Structure formats: C-alpha cells, structure tokens
C-alpha cells in the first residue's frame, strides 16, 4: 500500500497521525503515495554532524569534535526543521555546517551503488525517492541528513 519503509504512525505526545519511514527515519504529515525494486544507482548529498564518539572526531569545521551524540542529534533535528520550514536550504546548510569534506561540494557525494557506502547510509539512500530527504541516519561517522538528487 505504502512505498518501501513507510508506515502510518501517530504521536504519543499529541495524537496526530503522520507517516514514518523506518529505513530513512523520515517523518511527514503527507501520505507518501496517492515489482520495481530499488534504483541500481543513486546520487545523494548529505549533511554530517559528528560527535565525540565518531570514528574520526574531527573535521574542517573543528579539529576536535567534543559534542555528545545527543547534542549532535539536536543539531540534526534543528537543521531538518529549518529545511522543512523553508527558512534554510539543504545545500546552504551542508556547505556551512557539515562535518564532511563534501561540504565544499554543497554536500554532494556523487553517484554510488550498493556496497560502496556505510550500510545505514546506503539503506537510507536507496529507500529515498528522487528529491526526498531522510531523517537522522546514524553511522560510525556521525548523524547524517541525506538528500537524494538523482
């Protein structure tokens, strides 16, 4: 009925219905749809927020990442909120705040196939449809927001 990963959920805090993708961790009020499988290749941009437990706790933004995983998640959630509100743009935020060297490419990672990225990153990327944005995606590098561009 719903595309891969998508399920109809509701808030324990409130009670309002929404839609959640358990592969990309994306959430949205809009129903995600009104033998195709996955695309064989995708192109994605991403915004990475590292933390003290990241595999390399350093980046061009600071040689010593000291924020906790929770503080990194709170930053990721804030960036998602700014993008969804329209106040900020994904590429603009990735250029300024991504702890990945791809920030110089506005977050662009180019095209990739299965078996080339970290498994949680890969699973989310191939579950996004073109133009869709993930929720928080947890890898050994940190927490990502992923935007599928092709």
């Amino acid at each position: 009925k719903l595309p891969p990963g998508w399920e109809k959920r509701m808030s324990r805090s409130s009670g309002r219905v929404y839609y959640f993708n358990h592969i990309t961790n994306a959430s949205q009020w809009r129903r995600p749809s009104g033998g195709q499988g996955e695309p064989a290749r995708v192109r994605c941009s991403h915004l990475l927020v590292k933390h003290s437990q990241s595999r390399r706790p350093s980046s061009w933004r600071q040689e010593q990442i000291t924020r906790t995983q929770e503080e990194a998640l709170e930053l990721i959630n804030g960036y998602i909120q700014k993008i969804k509100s329209g106040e900020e743009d994904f590429e603009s935020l990735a250029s300024q705040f991504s702890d990945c060297s791809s920030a110089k490419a506005r977050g662009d990672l180019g095209a990739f196939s299965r078996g080339q990225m970290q498994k949680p990153f890969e699973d989310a990327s191939f579950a996004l449809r073109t133009g869709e944005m993930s929720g928080p995606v947890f890898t050994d590098s940190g927490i990502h927001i992923i935007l599928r561009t092709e």
């Binding site: 991403h46 990945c100 060297s101 078996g115 990225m117 970290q118 890969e122 590098s141």
Partner: peptide, 4 residues
C-alpha cells in the same frame, strides 16, 4: 567520510 562515509564509504564502506
């Protein structure tokens, strides 16, 4: 960095 990612990549596997």
């Amino acid at each position: 960095f990612x990549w596997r």
